[PDB]
Write a protein that binds this ligand. Sequence first.
Ligand SMILES: Nc1nc2c(ncn2[C@@H]2O[C@H](COP(=O)(O)OP(=O)(O)O[C@H]3O[C@H](C(=O)O)[C@@H](O)[C@H](O)[C@@H]3O)[C@@H](O)[C@H]2O)c(=O)[nH]1
Ligand SMILES: Nc1nc2c(ncn2[C@@H]2O[C@H](COP(=O)(O)OP(=O)(O)O[C@H]3O[C@H](C(=O)O)[C@@H](O)[C@H](O)[C@@H]3O)[C@@H](O)[C@H]2O)c(=O)[nH]1
Lengths: 436, 436
Amino acid sequence: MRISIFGLGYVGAVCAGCLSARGHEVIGVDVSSTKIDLINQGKSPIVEPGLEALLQQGRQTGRLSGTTDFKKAVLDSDVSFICVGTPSKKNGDLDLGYIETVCREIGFAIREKSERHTVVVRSTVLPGTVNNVVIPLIEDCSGKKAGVDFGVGTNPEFLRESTAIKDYDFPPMTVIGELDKQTGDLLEEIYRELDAPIIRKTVEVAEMIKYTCNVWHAAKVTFANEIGNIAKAVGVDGREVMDVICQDHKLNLSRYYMRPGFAFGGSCLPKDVRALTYRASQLDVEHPMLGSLMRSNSNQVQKAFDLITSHDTRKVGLLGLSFKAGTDDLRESPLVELAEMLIGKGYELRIFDRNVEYARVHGANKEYIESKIPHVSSLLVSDLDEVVASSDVLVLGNGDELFVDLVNKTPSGKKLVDLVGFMPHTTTAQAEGICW
Amino acid sequence: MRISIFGLGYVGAVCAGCLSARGHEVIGVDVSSTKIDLINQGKSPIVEPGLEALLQQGRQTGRLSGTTDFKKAVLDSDVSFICVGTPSKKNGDLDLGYIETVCREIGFAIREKSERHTVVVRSTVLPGTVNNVVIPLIEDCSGKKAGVDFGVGTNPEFLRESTAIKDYDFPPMTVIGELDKQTGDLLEEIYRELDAPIIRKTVEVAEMIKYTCNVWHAAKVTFANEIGNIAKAVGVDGREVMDVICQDHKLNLSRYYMRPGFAFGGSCLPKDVRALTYRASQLDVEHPMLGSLMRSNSNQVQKAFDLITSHDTRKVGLLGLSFKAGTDDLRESPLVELAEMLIGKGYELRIFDRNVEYARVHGANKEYIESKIPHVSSLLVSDLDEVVASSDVLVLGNGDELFVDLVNKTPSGKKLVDLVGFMPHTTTAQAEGICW
Ligand SMILES: Nc1nc2c(ncn2[C@@H]2O[C@H](COP(=O)(O)OP(=O)(O)O[C@H]3O[C@H](C(=O)O)[C@@H](O)[C@H](O)[C@@H]3O)[C@@H](O)[C@H]2O)c(=O)[nH]1
Ligand SMILES: Nc1nc2c(ncn2[C@@H]2O[C@H](COP(=O)(O)OP(=O)(O)O[C@H]3O[C@H](C(=O)O)[C@@H](O)[C@H](O)[C@@H]3O)[C@@H](O)[C@H]2O)c(=O)[nH]1
């Protein structure tokens, strides 16, 4: 394939060498004469193991070249990858400056070109960028329409500097953001050989996936460092602790706990976050991320409240009260806190929870249910169909399978508020998700 | 084996059932006759799948019994598991009330016992608790000493409510905080048959692991929730986003990024955290956890600085300057930030970095190095031995394998500050770790 690459930095130079190696005709394009000079001499502009050899091979085979002539590069390629920088502005927002000039440059170049050109954004940009910045600019400068007259997609990079070539050859996955099907198919063909999944999504979803990956990496480092600081302070090797945490692939290094949804609760998570942060504090160990968990958690409870009370009706049916489905435990249940907020604000609440109902009459926590929270437990209704029929707003609070049927066959005149993830798709006028 | 379990709540009742199902003769002890009466009837005090059947089996084989008579329980068992509650005090700290009580009971009961008895704490308690609270109480109440007379250890649990039996039967791992080898060996025998590693560590490390696991679980939930909230606000399904993140077992769901150490840097992680958080703010999306990362990160740079400037000497040698070993990239390097802090406070700094030195001669970054960061680059020394010879404090800043030798064979008169994890062991008078 004939490929142009705009930006020969840490990402673009790697893509040029990697694509060159795979048999494609590659034209690297940059504003820096110096970067263009080094590439044409087959030299690495950066220290990245293996890159020079690949640039070398690319020149020797005549498949790799560089230039500042963007118009010619476009003219002589079928697809252009945008790999220019997107640094922070002073305020932390992303600076689209470089993206915009390349978009203008590309737009003007396809204006005179009759063959269908394709533009793929590899540069990391915030959700909405392609739809609100890239496309309007390219369309405006070219006088042609996105998708129809030129292909447009995104293809976020997951390469780490110092292992960039291995990461390219052996990625966790390939992500493609697509508008027109043809560009998606084009990208699929380019990466077909790699031993990894090809994931095709909308452009906005692809952009959000990339950011989430990077912020997750940052969060992991921060977590380890804070745990580490606390360990040292109590006289233990933080590396030793983290080493055993990393041996658990059932809970720790798995997808469990990673579904967006509602606040956590129960008698262990909140209590242990509070104790560990309290100990850190006593030991003068700063811990901003760990110290923010309870606040974020309580914010999630408020968010649910905000959704539920936005419907101009006081009739609410809460499906689930225990902190998780399958248990009767009410200790620090967010659904109990939600219930109390609603009662406090005058809502006509009915609650369904088969486990708590059962425990109310058979078990060891009857006192707590009948005497400590009668204001909540007195609102229990044995029949699910009655909570549903008499309520205007139905909130799926925990994961009881009993609630599936309600979600897929919802009676008329109800508003669903999904805190768990039962809904097959995204928010509609009838049903809204806490994170979808 | 004969075993007594103290506290028949969500944890102990499961342990009682699971232990008896494995042939052990179990005596459950609780202060609540209500729980005790129900267990003797082969009935579960909570709703937990399969517990009743396990409890009835224990009753029908004569292996499971319940009582308020703790003296008899101790006399008639080889080991006592402490599974009592450890709830929050009003200020967030750990409430040790129930633990203390059980410790005095056992101690008294033990004063009599002829055979050596073994006490194992399953309850989640902070590091320092067994040595500063449990042992003193028992020892003082028994008239005996820990280790020689009675066994003592910890054995945290990782069971989840609603799937407690399955979790018990197939745990991620077994963790033992051992003091005397006899206790440890005893626990090993109990858990030998489980298909998962048995990890024996000190009591402090053991407890730190338990707290870390739970706080990690909370952090995962919180991350997914915050990302979910942002996703919803930008118009996408947060679960679809998180679903793809979870398809990456190389970087996302792996141990990568989980070593305690130094701040993160480079031209992507900081920039992307800042951009995402900026956008979230614009969209009125609160994000306390994501919003604390950059502050935690800058705190970690300060911590390293604090370690370094604590030795009453101005001769600092910084080993590593790029944000990562293996690359010359200096963008948002925390090592550069550290250097600038040391320079500003007047230290006499020498810096070694092979990759940055090379880039100063070959590559497209000669400018930033020679004209944007002269005050730092002019401190570069090409010879590692000279940096070591001339410096009093040596900072291991990134993971260059060239630094291994210095750590294993450290010349006399040097203080090491390890920011990455080269040290084989924990902090000493001559070498200190940022998290060990
Ligand atoms: N939003 C969201 N919430 C979740 C998810 N998964 C779990 N939760 C919630 O996290 C909370 C705790 O659930 P879980 O960890 O399954 O149960 P539990 O509290 O019983 O077990 C934890 O504490 C035990 C303990 O200390 O005793 C641990 O042993 C155990 O491993 C758990 O960490 C609950 O409120 C859940 O709803 C998720 O993917 N998304
Ligand atoms: N304390 C600690 N720090 C770590 C650890 N692992 C990495 N770091 C640091 O994390 C930072 C980032 O390193 P890394 O992710 O290896 O490199 P890079 O920044 O080049 O790649 C990341 O951004 C790319 C990108 O957006 O281009 C991503 O593609 C890529 O996947 C990474 O997420 C560096 O400062 C590291 O030193 C750890 O286990 N512990």
